[PDB]
Design a protein around this ligand. Structure first.
Ligand SMILES: N[C@@H](Cc1ccc(O)cc1)C(=O)O
Ligand SMILES: N[C@@H](Cc1ccc(O)cc1)C(=O)O
Lengths: 321, 321
C-alpha cells in the first residue's frame, strides 16, 4: 500500500512543514512534477548542512519527479538572514561567480541528468536577477509584498526586536528574490513545489503567494527538519569547522570518520535522514543492534552509505587507506 | 545686520525643521553652495502644493546659492509614501517620462539658468536609477540601511501600525532612492543641502546619513512648513481639485481668483510664504489694512505677486480679461 510520497518521507522524519498536504499528495498522484531546491554559494562548496535537502531532491526524483537544482548566483550576492543572528558577509561578484560553478558541478553527481523526462535541471537565479533593473524589481515584484507581513515573518522577527540584532535593507529584500525564483521557475519549467531546510518556510511561502499573485497558479512548499543531535550540540559542526562535501576540503577518509563517530542515540535517525535504506531495513538493524551483544553496526552502515553517496565507490575505498 | 539666510527664512515662517542650524549657517557664510529640491512627476504639472519649496529654491539662488531642480523620473515610478494614508498609483514608464519633461520645462522659468556660476541645474534621478541593476542597488546602497530604523521613521510609522493602512515593499524602498539622490548629487555637483516639504524630513535625513556613509561628507537638510489655513481646511484644495501651475490646467485668471479669495487670517502669512516682498513691507501692509476703513488690499497684492511669479506679466494681464 504505497500510501504516498509525503507519508513515506514523514516516516523518515524528513517532513518538518508542508503547505496543504492533502492537495500536494493529490497533485503528486496526478503525475511527475518539477520541483526545486535551492543552494546559495556562501562558500566554494556545500557542507553537511545542505545534504538532507539535496538527497531529498533525489528521493523525489526516484519517485519519478523532476528535480531542479537551483544555485543562487544572485541570492548569494545578497545573503539569506533567515534565523541568522548576524548580517552575512557580502562576497564579491567575481568570487560568487566562481563558487557558483563549483557548487553546480558538486551537485550534479547527486542527481540523474540522463533519465528521460524527469532528468534533473541545473538553474541559476543570476539568469534573471543578474541584469534586472532596480525599478523593474521594485515595481513588478515589490508591489506584491506587504512590509507589514514581511516584518512579522518568523525568519527575521528576532532581527527586528533587537538591542543586539539588526537587519539591513539588503538582507530584508532576500525574501522577494527567493519568492520570485519560485514564480519564475513555475513559469518556465512548471515547477509547482519547492523544498528546503527548516529555516526556509517564510521564503518558500512568499514564493507560493507571489506565484499565485503573478501567475494565478497554486504551488506548494515542504521543508525538511533541521538536523539535531541528542546531546544538543550542533550537527555537522566539528572543532575544525564544517564537514564539506568537497573531497579537497574534507577528505573522504575524514568524512567516513565523521559518520563512524555518530552517537548511538542519533545513528538510526541519521540512517533515515541520510541514506536510501528502506525503513524496514533500518528498523531491523536497530533491533539487531539491540539484541546482539556486539558493537552496534549501524555506525559502520551509515558511514558506508553516506560516504558512497557523497564520494562514490572511489571515496569509500579511499576511506580505508 | 544681515543676521543670516536661515534666520531670514525663519522670520517668514518658512523653516519647519533644519539639521544643525549653527553648522549650516556657518557653511552658508563660507560662500555659495549648491542645494537641491526635488519634485516627483505624479501628474503632468506641479500644483500649489509644490510652490513654497520651489520659490524657496529661488530665495536661496537670490542669496547667491546654486539651485539644483531635481525632477524624479525614477522616484516618480515608485511613489513617496511619506505621511500618505494609501499606496500611490503606479504610473507607466511612458507616461512618467512625458510628465518629467513637462515638469522640467514648467520649473525652468522660476529659476535663473543664465546668471554665472550660481546658474540653476536641472537634474533627473532616472539618469542613475534608470539603468541601475537590482543587485547593485541592494548591495551598494541597501547595505547602509537599517530596517529597524526605517520602520520607526515618522513618515511611514502609521502605515505599519495598521488595520487600515499597509505599505508595499515598493514604497518602503522609496526612502533609499531619495537618500541616494542626495549622495549622488553631493558627489557630482557638490550639493551639501537639500530642502523640501515638511513631509520630507525622514527622506532628507536618510540622504544626510547615506552621504556621510558613502562619501564621508557632512551635508544638511531643511524642510519648509506644510501650508495651513486658519479655518483648518486643506490649502491649495478646491471643489475642482488642485490649483495647477500649468496655465492650460488652471488658467491665470482662475489662479488670480484663487488668491483673491484668500481669508484675512491667512493673507499676511501667505504674503510671506509666496512672495518676495520684504518682511518690513508686509508688516506695514498689515498695519495699513488694520487702520484703513477700507477693504484689505493684501489679497490684491498677493494675487498680483504670485500670479506674476507663476505666469509672468502676460498671465497677470490675462487675469483681468
Ligand atoms: N535561501 C536558501 C537557498 C535558496 C536560494 C534561492 C532559491 O530560489 C531557493 C533557495 C538557503 O539559504 O538555503
Ligand atoms: N520625495 C519628494 C520629491 C523628491 C524626489 C527625489 C529627490 O531626490 C528629492 C525629492 C516629494 O515627494 O516631494
Amino acid at each position: 500500500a504505497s500510501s504516498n510520497l509525503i507519508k513515506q518521507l514523514q516516516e523518515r522524519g524528513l517532513v518538518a512543514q508542508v503547505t496543504d498536504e492533502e492537495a500536494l499528495a493529490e497533485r503528486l498522484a496526478q503525475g511527475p512534477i518539477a520541483l526545486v531546491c535551492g543552494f546559495d554559494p556562501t562558500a566554494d562548496s556545500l557542507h553537511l548542512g545542505h545534504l538532507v535537502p539535496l538527497l531529498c531532491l533525489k528521493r523525489f526524483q526516484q519517485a519519478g519527479h523532476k528535480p531542479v537544482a537551483l544555485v543562487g548566483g544572485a541570492t548569494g550576492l545578497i545573503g539569506d538572514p533567515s534565523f541568522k543572528a548576524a548580517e552575512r558577509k557580502l562576497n564579491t561578484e567575481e568570487t560568487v561567480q566562481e563558487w557558483v560553478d563549483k557548487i553546480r558541478k558538486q551537485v550534479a553527481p547527486f542527481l540523474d541528468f540522463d533519465c528521460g523526462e524527469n532528468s534533473a535541471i541545473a538553474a541559476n537565479n543570476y539568469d534573471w536577477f543578474g541584469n534586472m533593473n532596480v525599478l523593474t524589481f521594485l515595481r513588478d515584484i515589490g508591489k506584491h509584498f506587504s512590509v507589514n507581513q514581511m516584518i512579522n515573518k518568523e525568519a527575521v522577527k528576532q532581527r527586528l526586536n533587537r538591542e543586539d540584532q539588526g537587519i539591513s535593507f539588503t538582507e530584508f529584500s532576500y525574501n522577494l528574490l527567493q519568492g520570485y525564483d519560485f514564480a519564475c521557475l513555475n513559469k518556465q519549467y512548471g515547477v509547482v513545489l519547492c523544498i528546503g531546510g527548516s529555516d526556509q518556510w517564510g521564503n518558500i511561502t512568499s514564493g507560493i503567494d507571489l506565484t499565485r499573485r503573478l501567475h494565478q497558479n497554486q504551488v506548494f512548499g515542504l521543508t525538511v527538519p533541521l538536523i539535531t543531535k541528542a546531546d544538543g550540540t550542533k550537527f555537522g559542526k566539528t572543532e575544525g569547522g564544517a564537514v564539506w562535501l568537497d573531497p579537497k576540503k574534507t577528505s573522504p577518509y575524514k568524512f567516513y570518520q565523521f559518520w563512524i563517530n555518530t552517537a548511538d542515540a542519533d545513528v538510526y535517525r541519521f540512517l533515515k535522514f541520510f541514506t536510501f535504506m528502506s525503513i524496514e531495513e533500518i528498523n531491523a538493524l536497530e533491533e539487531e543492534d539491540k539484541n546482539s551483544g556486539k558493537a552496534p553496526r549501524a555506525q559502520y552502515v551509515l558511514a558506508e552509505q553516506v560516504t558512497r553517496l557523497v564520494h562514490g565507490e572511489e571515496g569509500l575505498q579511499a576511506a580505508k587507506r
